Design a protein around this motif. Structure first.
Motif, short mmCIF file in Angstrom:
data_model
loop_
_atom_site.label_atom_id
_atom_site.label_comp_id
_atom_site.label_asym_id
_atom_site.label_seq_id
_atom_site.Cartn_x
_atom_site.Cartn_y
_atom_site.Cartn_z
N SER A 11 -41.76 17.35 71.87
CA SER A 11 -41.59 17.99 73.16
C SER A 11 -42.47 17.33 74.20
CB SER A 11 -41.90 19.48 73.09
OG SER A 11 -43.29 19.69 72.96
N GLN A 12 -41.98 17.28 75.44
CA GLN A 12 -42.72 16.73 76.56
C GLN A 12 -42.72 17.75 77.68
OE1 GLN A 12 -42.89 12.52 77.43
NE2 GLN A 12 -40.96 12.22 76.30
N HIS A 13 -43.91 18.23 78.04
CA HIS A 13 -44.12 19.17 79.13
C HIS A 13 -44.78 18.42 80.28
CE1 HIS A 13 -46.25 23.07 80.67
NE2 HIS A 13 -45.31 22.63 81.50
N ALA A 14 -44.09 18.32 81.43
CA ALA A 14 -44.62 17.60 82.58
C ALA A 14 -44.74 18.52 83.78
CB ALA A 14 -43.76 16.38 82.93
#
Lengths: 131, 131
Positions: A11-14
């Motif tokens: 997962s990538q949270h930006a």
């Protein structure tokens, strides 16, 4: 003859305010890439990048006292172990730290000159294997 | 001016026997299978079943005699990719223009008596923080 089964999740949270995003984070710890997504230059002298890898001790990179990321442009900040070449304005080497750090939770935060977090990108990887 | 999103990419894989679903193109051009073992695998009249969410099932049928040799890959291309049919390494699914794209792609390998012997499922989620 052995059966196999696994589940992986990445997962990538930006989050970005202002002109500069944390665009890409190397899972192998070699670099962090920022991008000025605006139509104006961004002064980043004595800005910082804070790196929290799980419960590992915080790692902090500090930009040169004068640095400008121009409108539309990218800068890659390389850990010393990556064997990259220092070549401003697109490539900077962090000589003191050999890696940005590897692991299952990597939080990279961009800090402006007065200490506020203005953008971040967090990578989380989970893997379960059937036994 | 502020932006924020969380994306996640999950892969669930299961393999029995000699042949794994190794790679599934998210653009729908191909599926690659791998004989991970030290022995040849006969796959005459085997099938690949592709479930893309609640889309209609797509089913590829292997030639009535096909062998995937020990250690080797075969790539099954959708007709839309413009690959050249070159057995045994590349097979073209001439009737079907795409393997299908979307947020949930399940690719299953079926042997000649209808048993699912391997699968790989790719799932993508993305949530954008609301204004």
């Amino acid at each position: 003859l052995e059966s196999t089964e696994s589940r992986s999740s990445f997962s990538q949270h930006a989050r970005t305010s202002g002109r500069v995003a944390v665009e890409e984070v190397d899972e192998e710890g070699k670099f962090v890439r920022l991008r000025n997504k605006s139509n104006e230059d961004q002064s980043m002298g004595n800005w910082q990048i804070k790196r929290q890898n799980g419960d590992d001790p915080l790692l902090t990179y500090r930009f040169p006292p004068k640095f400008t990321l121009k409108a539309g442009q990218v800068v890659t900040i390389w850990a010393a172990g990556a064997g990259a070449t220092h070549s401003p304005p697109t490539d900077l080497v962090w000589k003191a730290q050999n890696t940005w750090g590897c692991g299952n939770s990597l939080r990279t935060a961009l800090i402006n000159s007065t200490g506020e977090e203005v953008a971040m990108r967090k990578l989380v990887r989970s893997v379960t294997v059937v036994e």
